[PDB]
Amino acid sequence: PFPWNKIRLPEYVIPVHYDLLIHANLTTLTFWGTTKVEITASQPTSTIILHSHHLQISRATLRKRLSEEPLQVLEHPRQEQIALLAPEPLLVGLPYTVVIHYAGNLSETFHGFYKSTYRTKEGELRILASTQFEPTAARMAFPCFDEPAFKASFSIKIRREPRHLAISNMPLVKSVTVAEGLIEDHFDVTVKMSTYLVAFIISDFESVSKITKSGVKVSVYAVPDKINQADYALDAAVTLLEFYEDYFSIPYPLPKQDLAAIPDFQSGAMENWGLTTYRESALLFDAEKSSASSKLGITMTVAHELAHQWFGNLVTMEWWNDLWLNEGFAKFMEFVSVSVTHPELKVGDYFFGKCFDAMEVDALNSSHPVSTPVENPAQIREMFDDVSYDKGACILNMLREYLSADAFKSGIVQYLQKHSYKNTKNEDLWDSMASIVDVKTMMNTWTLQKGFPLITITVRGRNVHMKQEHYMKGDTGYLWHVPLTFITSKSDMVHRFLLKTKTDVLILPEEVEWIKFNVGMNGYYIVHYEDDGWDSLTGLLKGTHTAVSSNDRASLINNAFQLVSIGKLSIEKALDLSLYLKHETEIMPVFQGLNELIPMYKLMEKRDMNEVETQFKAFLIRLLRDLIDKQTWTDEGSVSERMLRSQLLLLACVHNYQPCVQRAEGYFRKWKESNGNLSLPVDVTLAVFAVGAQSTEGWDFLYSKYQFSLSSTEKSQIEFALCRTQNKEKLQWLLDESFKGDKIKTQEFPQILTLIGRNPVGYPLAWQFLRKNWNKLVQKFELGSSSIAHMVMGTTNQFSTRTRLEEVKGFFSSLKENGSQLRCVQQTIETIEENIGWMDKNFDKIRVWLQSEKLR
Ligand SMILES: *[C@@H]1O[C@H](CO)[C@@H](O[C@@H]2O[C@H](CO)[C@@H](O)[C@H](O)[C@H]2NC(C)=O)[C@H](O)[C@H]1NC(C)=O
Ligand SMILES: *[C@@H]1O[C@H](CO)[C@@H](O[C@@H]2O[C@H](CO)[C@@H](O)[C@H](O)[C@H]2NC(C)=O)[C@H](O)[C@H]1NC(C)=O
Ligand SMILES: *[C@@H]1O[C@H](CO)[C@@H](O)[C@H](O)[C@H]1NC(C)=O
Ligand SMILES: *[C@@H]1O[C@H](CO)[C@@H](O)[C@H](O)[C@H]1NC(C)=O
Ligand code: NA
Ligand code: NA
Ligand code: NA
Ligand code: NA
Ligand SMILES: [Zn+2]
C-alpha cells in the first residue's frame, strides 16, 4: 500500500548534499552503492519519498554526536519511487541523513550507468562504464530526489581496479587502496546542481589538456587509438570557454572541464558539469579525413555543451515544461559564440535553416507550445525536440533583434546573475528582459501557444495593410505580438512595425516598386503578398536577385512553397519562382532550393510515378547544371564552398548525371585498385562511395574497409553509401547487423534505418523492420526519445497514400501503452495526411508544368 500517489515528488522533504559511493565491476557488469543524502524537512512528516529505478535496495537507515535508526522500504516501480517509513515523525528544520545501500546491473541501454565497448586496433574487446542521466535516469544509478529543482552538492567516490581510470564532475583529490586490487577515488564536492548533471566514467581513456587564460584545465579524453584526433576539439573548447567567460562576465566555477568521447552514446553530446560527453563522431577530428561538415559540427557541438555550463547547469529550468530555457538558449548561443571565435565558419548564415525546420513540425496541429505541461519520463524526453531547440533559439533571435543585442545581452546577464545555482520559469526570463517594453505579453504569445502566423501584406499606393492569422496545414483565433521588419525598392534600412492586432496599416513615405517583409528571416513567421506581390518579387529574383540578400532569397523560396500547402499560391507559381536559381550562386539559397524540391521527388519515389519522378529529377539537375559543372573535384575553398561541392556532386551522381557518374566511377575503381589506400578528396568521397556501392563487388569492398577505419567521417560516408544500394539483401543485412550491434554499432541503427527508409527501393524494408522489432528498439532507445521519433518519422513521413496512412494508424494504435500516444506518431500521421492532400492536388499540375517546362 504505497503512501504517495503522485509522479511528482513531495515538495516538503528537501536534499542538501549527497555522498555517493559507487563500486562497479566491469567483468560481472554489476555495481554496488551507498547513498547518504543530507536532508531537512519544511514540515513534519514520517515518510520520505524519492526516486529509484531498477535498483535493489538492501537496507535503508535514518541518522539524526548521536543516533541512527532503520527505515522500512516500499517500492512503486511504475512511479519509479521508493518510500522510506520512519518510526518517529520527522522533525521540521532539523538536519537528517538518509543512508541507502543498494545494488544494480550495469545498464545495457544508452542511459543510466551503462556499459560501453570497443575493439583495440589488434582485435581485443575492451569494456568501460559511463553515465547518461538527463532527463530522468540518475535514479537508475543512485536513489535521489530526481527532479531538477532539488539541487544539491555531490561528493562522489568511485571504487575501481588499478588498471582503470575514473573521472567525474570534479577533480580527483585522493586515491586510497582499500583492498587488494581495489582503489577508492575521491572527487571534490560539486557546486549545487541538479541530479541529471552527475557523471562518472570508468575506462582506459587517454587525454590531452590545455589551460585557459582563467586557469581552467581543459582536457579531451578518448580511447588510446583515437586520442591523436582530440587536438581540434581541445583548442575549440579552450577558445569557446574563454569566450563565454568573457561574454557573460560570470566565470566558469570549476577547476577543470573534461570532454570525453564515449564509444557508445545515444545522442550527440551531454553537458554534465565538468565532464561533458560526446559521441566519438561529434568530438574527434582527423585532419586528413574529416569533412568540412564535421569540423563545423564539432565546433558547434562544443559551443552548445559549453553554453550549457551557464544555460542549464548554473541556471536550470524549474521543471521540464520549461526545458526550452536550457535548450533554446544553448542552441542560440552556438551562433553567438562561434560567429566570434570561428568567423571563417560564417555560422550566422546557417541559422535561419533551423527556423524552417521548426516550422515544418510547428505548422501541424500536433505541435505543442514551447512551454507546455509534461509529467512522465516519456513525455519529458519528447520535449527534446525541434520546438525546444530550434523554435526556442529562433524566437530568442527574433527577440534579440527586437530589443537590440545590447539590451538583450544585459537581460541575459542579469538573468544568469540573479538565478545562479537556482531554477527559473518562463516568467523569470521575461521579468529579467523587461528590467532593462512589455516583453512578457509579447513573448507569452510566442511561448504559450503553438504555431506561427501567416502575415498577409496588401499594398494600395503608399498604404501597406497587414493581417495576421494562424498558419496551419493544410481558425483558432491565435494572436501574436509580431515584430515585423521590411525593406523596399527605395530603402534598404530595416524598418520595424509591431503588429499586435489582427490587422493594422502603415503608410510609406513614397510609393515603391516592391516591399519585402521579414528581413534576413529573423522573424518566426511567414509572409504572403496579395495582388501582384509574388509576381513582383519573382521578377526581382529573376532580374536583379542581388537586390535582396542571400537569406532574403532563401526566405522567399521557402515561403512560396509553404503558401502552396494552404492554397495561397499555385504550385506552378512557386515552381516558376524557383527557376531563378539557375543564376544563383550562394550556398543558402541553393541549399534552400534543394530542401524545397527534393522532398517532392521523395514523395514520388514511394508511388507508381516513375515517369514524373524521372522528369522532376532531370529538371532539378538541369536547374543547377551550371553550378554542378563549375564544381572542382578537390577540397578547396571555404567550409560553405566545400559543403556545397560535396552535396552537388552527390546529388548529380545519385541521379545519374553522366559526367559526374563517370568521374566518380573512375575514382572508385582507383580507390579499390589501391586496396583502399588512396587518399581521395574528402569533398568528393560521398559521391564516389555512393556510386561504388551500387555493385556487389564495390559494396563488399566498402564494407570490408569499415571494420578498420578510425575516422568518423569515413565510416559515416561508408554507411551512407552502403545504405544507397538497390540490393535488398544487403539493405536487410545492414538493418540486422546494426540492430545486433557487433559488426556495426547499435548507436548507428537509427541513422541506418532512416537512410534505408529514404532509399527509393529500400523504404518498405525499413518500415517493416521498425514494425517487426518495435519492442526491442523501444527497450534500447526509450519511448519519447529523439531516436525513436527519428525512426518513426524517417520510415513513414514520406508516404502519401490512404493505404499507407492506415498502416501507420493501425500499427501504432495496436501498441496501446507501448507507443500509441507518442507525439511523433500523431505528427507523422498528420504529415502523411498532408502528403495525401498535397499530392492529390499538385501531382498532375507538376506533371504538366514539367512538360510545358521548356525554359529548363
Ligand atoms: C541483475 O540481474 C540479475 C540476473 O541474474 C537479477 O538477479 C535475479 O533476480 C531474480 C529475482 O529477484 C532471482 O530470482 C534470480 O535468482 C536472480 N539471479 C541471480 C543469478 O542471482 C537481479 O535482480 C538484477 N538486479 C537488479 C537490481 O535488477
Ligand atoms: C570484479 O570481480 C572479479 C571477480 O568477480 C574480481 O577479480 C578478482 O580479483 C582478485 C583480486 O584482484 C583476484 O585474487 C581474483 O582472482 C579475481 N577473480 C577473478 C575471477 O578474476 C575483480 O577484482 C572485481 N573488480 C572490482 C572493481 O570489483
Ligand atoms: C486539432 O486537434 C484537436 C484535438 O486533437 C481537435 O479538436 C481539432 O479539431 C484539430 N484540428 C483540426 C484542424 O483537425
Ligand atoms: C596507406 O598505407 C600507408 C602504410 O600503411 C599508411 O601510412 C597511409 O596513411 C595510408 N594512406 C591512407 C590514405 O589510408
Ligand atoms: Na539501475
Ligand atoms: Na507560437
Ligand atoms: Na510551438
Ligand atoms: Na497548387
Ligand atoms: Zn542542449
8-state DSSP, 32: E
Helices and strands in the chain: count of H runs, count of E runs: 28, 29
Identify the CATH number of the domain in which residue 626 sits: 1.25.50.20
392 and 328 Cβ atoms separated by less than 8 Å: yes
DSSP 313-366: TTEEESSGGGTHHHHHHHHHHHHHHHHHH-GGG-GGGGHHHHHHHHHHHHTSTT
Q: In what order do the strands lie in the sheet with 112-119?
A: 112-119, 125-132, 200-203, 165-168
Query: Residues with beta carbon < 5 A to ion ligand 8?
Result: 570-571
8-state DSSP, 375: -
Q: Are strands 526-529 and 453-460 parallel, antiparallel or unpaired?
A: parallel
Among 529, 562, 589, the domain-final residue is 529
| Grid coordinates belonging to 623 | 536547374
Asked if residue 695 and residue 641 are part of one domain, the reply reads yes
Asked if residue 426 and residue 290 are part of one domain, the reply reads yes
Closest CA to 525 of 633, 452, 428, 449: 452
Among 512, 529, 546, the domain-final residue is 529
Residues after which the chain is broken (C–N above 2.5 A) are 64, 436, 474
623 and 653 Cβ atoms separated by less than 8 Å: no
φ, ψ (nearest 5 deg) of residue 468 = -120, 145
CA angle, corner 722, sides to 718 and 725, nearest 5?
145
Tell me how far apart the alpha carbons of residues 277 and 261 are, in angstroms, rounded to a whole number: 6
| Grid coordinates belonging to 590 | 541553393
Pocket test for ligand 2, best of 30, 157, 160, 161 (most atoms within 8 A of CB): 161
Query: If residue 507 lies in a helix (H) or strand (E), which one and from where to where?
Result: strand 503-507
CA of 706 to the centre of ligand 4 (A): 15
CA of 670 to the centre of ligand 4 (A): 15
Cβ neighbour number for residue 502 with a 10 Å cutoff: 11
The answer to the question of whether 269 is labelled as a binding residue is: yes
User: Which residue carries 552514446 as its cell?
Assistant: 265
Identify the CATH number of the domain in which residue 471 sits: 2.60.40.1910
User: Which residue carries 533551423 as its cell?
Assistant: 354
Q: Is the beta carbon of 708 within 6 A of some atom in ligand 4?
A: no
Pocket test for ligand 1, best of 105, 109, 115 (most atoms within 8 A of CB): 105
The answer to the question of whether 186 is labelled as a binding residue is: no
132 and 270 Cβ atoms separated by less than 8 Å: yes
| Grid coordinates belonging to 803 | 493505404
Tell me how far apart the alpha carbons of residues 201 and 130 are, in angstroms, rounded to a whole number: 4
Q: Is the beta carbon of 162 within 6 A of some atom in ligand 2?
A: no
Which residue spans within 26-171 are E strands per DSSP? 30-41, 47-51, 56-63, 68-70, 72-76, 81-85, 96-105, 112-119, 125-132, 153-160, 165-168
794 and 800 Cβ atoms separated by less than 8 Å: no
Cβ neighbour number for residue 739 with a 10 Å cutoff: 17
> Which residue has the CA at smallest separation from atom 5 of ligand 2?
28
Tell me how far apart the alpha carbons of residues 395 and 415 are, in angstroms, rounded to a whole number: 17
Query: If residue 279 lies in a helix (H) or strand (E), which one and from where to where?
Result: strand 275-279
311 and 424 Cβ atoms separated by less than 8 Å: no
Non-local CB neighbours of 267 within 8 Å, separated by 6+ positions: 132, 279, 786, 787
Asked if residue 408 and residue 509 are part of one domain, the reply reads no
Q: Which domain holds residue 408?
A: 206-451
Tell me how far apart the alpha carbons of residues 83 and 9 are, in angstroms, rounded to a whole number: 11
Ligand nearest to the CA of 28: 2
Asked if residue 409 and residue 498 are part of one domain, the reply reads no
φ, ψ (nearest 5 deg) of residue 768 = -60, -45
Q: Pick the atom of ligand 4 nearest to 288's CA.
A: 13
CA of 616 to the centre of ligand 8 (A): 16
Cβ neighbour number for residue 568 with a 10 Å cutoff: 18
Asked if residue 718 and residue 624 are part of one domain, the reply reads yes
Non-local CB neighbours of 143 within 8 Å, separated by 6+ positions: 35, 50, 51, 52, 55, 57, 82, 100, 102
| Grid coordinates belonging to 517 | 517583409
Identify the CATH number of the domain in which residue 159 sits: 2.60.40.1730
Asked if residue 580 and residue 512 are part of one domain, the reply reads no
The answer to the question of whether 270 is labelled as a binding residue is: yes
Q: Pick the atom of ligand 1 nearest to 55's CA.
A: 27
Tell me how far apart the alpha carbons of residues 159 and 177 are, in angstroms, rounded to a whole number: 9
> Which residue has the CA at smallest separation from atom 9 of ligand 4?
677
587 and 640 Cβ atoms separated by less than 8 Å: yes
Tell me how far apart the alpha carbons of residues 574 and 732 are, in angstroms, rounded to a whole number: 39
| Region label for 464, one of left (φ > 0), alpha (ψ between -120 and 50) or beta (otherwise) | beta
> Which residue has the CA at smallest separation from atom 24 of ligand 2?
25
Cβ neighbour number for residue 249 with a 10 Å cutoff: 10
CA of 326 to the centre of ligand 7 (A): 16
The answer to the question of whether 511 is labelled as a binding residue is: no
Separation of CA 107 from chain center: 23
Query: If residue 824 lies in a helix (H) or strand (E), which one and from where to where?
Result: helix 823-852
Asked if residue 576 and residue 456 are part of one domain, the reply reads no
Separation of CA 793 from chain center: 15
φ, ψ (nearest 5 deg) of residue 430 = -60, -40
| Grid coordinates belonging to 677 | 589506400
Q: What is the 3-state secondary structure (H, E, C) of 642-691?
A: HHHHHHHHHHHHHCCCHHHHHHHHHHHHHHHHCCCCCCCCHHHHHHHHHH
> Which residue has the CA at smallest separation from atom 12 of ligand 2?
181
| Grid coordinates belonging to 335 | 551562433
Q: Is the beta carbon of 675 within 6 A of some atom in ligand 4?
A: no
> Which residue has the CA at smallest separation from atom 8 of ligand 2?
181
Residue type, 455: I
Tell me how far apart the alpha carbons of residues 359 and 375 are, in angstroms, rounded to a whole number: 25
> Which residue has the CA at smallest separation from atom 3 of ligand 4?
677
Asked if residue 593 and residue 624 are part of one domain, the reply reads yes
Q: Is the beta carbon of 634 within 6 A of some atom in ligand 4?
A: no
| Grid coordinates belonging to 828 | 507523422
Asked if residue 615 and residue 585 are part of one domain, the reply reads yes
Q: Is the beta carbon of 679 within 6 A of some atom in ligand 4?
A: yes
Non-local CB neighbours of 686 within 8 Å, separated by 6+ positions: 646, 649, 650, 717, 720, 721
CA of 202 to the centre of ligand 8 (A): 58
Ligand nearest to the CA of 786: 9
- Pocket residues for ligand 1 (CB within 6 Å)? 54-56, 103-105
Asked if residue 538 and residue 659 are part of one domain, the reply reads yes
CA of 767 to the centre of ligand 3 (A): 27
The answer to the question of whether 54 is labelled as a binding residue is: no
Active site residue 584: no
Using omega within 30 degrees of 0 as the cis cutoff, is the peptide bond preceding 474 cis?
A: yes
Exposure on the CB side of residue 815, measured as CA atoms within 13 A:
20
**Helix, coil or strand: residue 369:** coil
Asked if residue 185 and residue 322 are part of one domain, the reply reads no
395 and 447 Cβ atoms separated by less than 8 Å: yes
Among 493, 512, 529, the domain-final residue is 529
Non-local CB neighbours of 322 within 8 Å, separated by 6+ positions: 371, 424, 425, 426
Q: Name the β-bridge partners of 453.
A: 470
782 and 109 Cβ atoms separated by less than 8 Å: yes
364 to each of 359, 565, 832, 833, how far by Cα in Å? 9, 12, 11, 11
Identify the CATH number of the domain in which residue 335 sits: 1.10.390.10
Domain count, the chain: 4
Cβ neighbour number for residue 735 with a 10 Å cutoff: 23
680 to each of 688, 689, 718, how far by Cα in Å? 9, 10, 13
Asked if residue 180 and residue 230 are part of one domain, the reply reads no
DSSP 122-152: TS-EEEEEEEE-TTTTGGGTS-B--STTS-B
Q: Which of 305, 586, 748, 853 is catalytic?
A: 305
| Grid coordinates belonging to 678 | 588512396
Query: If residue 722 lies in a helix (H) or strand (E), which one and from where to where?
Result: helix 712-722
The answer to the question of whether 495 is labelled as a binding residue is: no
Closest CA to 584 of 559, 550, 538, 620: 550
Pocket test for ligand 1, best of 31, 55, 56 (most atoms within 8 A of CB): 56
Tell me how far apart the alpha carbons of residues 530 and 499 are, in angstroms, rounded to a whole number: 18
Packed helices 351-362 and 587-605: angle between N→C axes, nearest 10 degrees: 30
The answer to the question of whether 272 is labelled as a binding residue is: yes
